[PDB]
Design an enzyme around this catalytic site. Sequence first.
Site, PDB file in Angstrom:
ATOM      1  N   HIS A  35       1.890  14.825 -18.442  1.00 29.34           N
ATOM      2  CA  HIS A  35       1.773  13.995 -17.214  1.00 29.34           C
ATOM      3  C   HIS A  35       1.144  14.814 -16.084  1.00 29.34           C
ATOM      4  CE1 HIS A  35       4.908  15.681 -14.760  1.00 29.34           C
ATOM      5  NE2 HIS A  35       5.843  15.487 -15.659  1.00 29.34           N
ATOM      6  N   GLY A  45       7.804  19.160  -9.409  1.00 29.26           N
ATOM      7  CA  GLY A  45       7.223  20.421  -9.837  1.00 29.26           C
ATOM      8  C   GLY A  45       8.145  21.311 -10.668  1.00 29.26           C
ATOM      9  N   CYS A  94       8.977  20.125 -13.487  1.00 30.79           N
ATOM     10  CA  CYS A  94       8.591  19.636 -14.826  1.00 30.79           C
ATOM     11  C   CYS A  94       7.951  20.793 -15.590  1.00 30.79           C
ATOM     12  CB  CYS A  94       7.657  18.442 -14.693  1.00 30.79           C
ATOM     13  SG  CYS A  94       8.423  17.028 -13.863  1.00 30.79           S
TER      14      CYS A  94
END
Lengths: 304, 304
Positions: free
Chosen positions: B41, B143, B145
């Site tokens: 993503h 962030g 992730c």
Amino acid sequence: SGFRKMAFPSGKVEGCMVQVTCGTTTLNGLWLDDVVYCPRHVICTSEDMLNPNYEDLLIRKSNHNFLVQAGNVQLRVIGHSMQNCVLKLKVDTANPKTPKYKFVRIQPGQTFSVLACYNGSPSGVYQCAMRPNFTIKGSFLNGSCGSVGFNIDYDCVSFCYMHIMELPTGVHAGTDLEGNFYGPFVDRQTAQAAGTDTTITVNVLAWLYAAVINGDRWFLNRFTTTLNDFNLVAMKYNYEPLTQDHVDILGPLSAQTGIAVLDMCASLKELLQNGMNGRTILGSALLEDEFTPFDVVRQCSGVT
Amino acid sequence: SGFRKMAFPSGKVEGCMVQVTCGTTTLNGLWLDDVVYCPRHVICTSEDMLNPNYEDLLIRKSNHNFLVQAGNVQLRVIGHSMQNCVLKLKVDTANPKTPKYKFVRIQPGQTFSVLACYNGSPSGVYQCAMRPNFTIKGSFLNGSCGSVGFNIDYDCVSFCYMHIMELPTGVHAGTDLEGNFYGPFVDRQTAQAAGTDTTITVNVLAWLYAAVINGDRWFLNRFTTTLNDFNLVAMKYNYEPLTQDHVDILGPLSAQTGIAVLDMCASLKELLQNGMNGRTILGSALLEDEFTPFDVVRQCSGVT
């Protein structure tokens, strides 16, 4: 999203951990530059622990009696010295992994990360608060002595604590890295008084704030309270009295949530007086005081 | 003495964390050998997230569009590939800090250590359990992730999870390192069902055992219960049904404490039916299911 007790990364401290063996005792030591820091009770036997004349016990011991080991490599001890309740062993080699570091004596209510070790090898890592009575609630087995508490500020590691003794409560007591115990404790196997442990009120109010930030606001009340009046209820429940400085610190939080500090104090006052009625704040059915306002901000900000 | 939630040392994983930036998205990536692993993503924008045709979105993207950075050094991307919901970016350089490692898909009830990061930089570390519904209760901001869950077995790091999505419960969902989500979740900004979260019964019974080992035995009852009868009460309270294998695993613990598993189950049955009456087990006013029997043993043994 979500709020968890969170320890600082352990990587830098990991590289500063060495096995120290004196006679039959083995524990953990901290190798920074040319010095290895260890609890002085490594010299003591079981019998020695009950009445230790550490000055006399150290005179018998000599550099060659100290077995410092990093991984599978041994260090040459070329000097021993006893500062307070910590022994500093000069070695030939500088730790090439020695990081930017400071030694700080921490104030009660402050928090730090424990890197728990055994035989110089890191086992795990968890957050701790220096309880107002100067004990801590850790996880420390035989040979975890020498394991250290630290905070990180970007490059620098502020070492604040070294595990030395377990108290019969189950809790723990240790020194700053200069070897001075937090609290009225000593390195002796004697009955030791872990006095009344009071709750770090400012830290609970920060956690309450952290909950609000994560969307838990059931506790919130419709009224307020005064410093004096609040503290009158704090005392009853063995809470630290709240100060104007405590308020000032809880300001950015107060601001960010659009909630005044005394209104939060009133919600705490109900929570104390009345309990939680089977509910949970941030996955906990009781109030958490091991979260400094900075700690809550650091997770909410996302500081690395 | 003392029992604390305890994360594995983060040092080895620390050195495997890199900033990945695709267009305006920045998140965390895992650099092992010549490959950097990141949530796919990173390619997606806000609008892209609502209906992402990742195959089509990746065709537009090319190696030079991927900004991989370690510290202040950039890596040359010489190949992109999308395995399930993770993108593997081949780079010119091998990570010299690449450690012995495995990629394991973890079973529900299992636990791991999260090294939470921002922009490739480690922020902190905490323990997590893979909830039966395949969510987790972490701390993950924008962030975070790409931040990964891992277990260590001496030299080897078994990577088990990568943070990808936050659910509106507050909880979190992610993949194994092969890019398959734990659970019925997808990398899309759509309503997502975090189904009934059941309690890992075996893990609570291990915690109860851990409490006994630390000297808390108020919960202990004078009677016993059967698997069938116990599970009849477990179901009511949304507990996982207890199995003979669960019993077998809780054996060393049962043995060490001189307490039978079903007698412990009977104490849990009272604790469920009747509550805790304002008391605490191991400093907690509710039951803890994020402790695997191995986790309790590892602290009690003192494994490093």
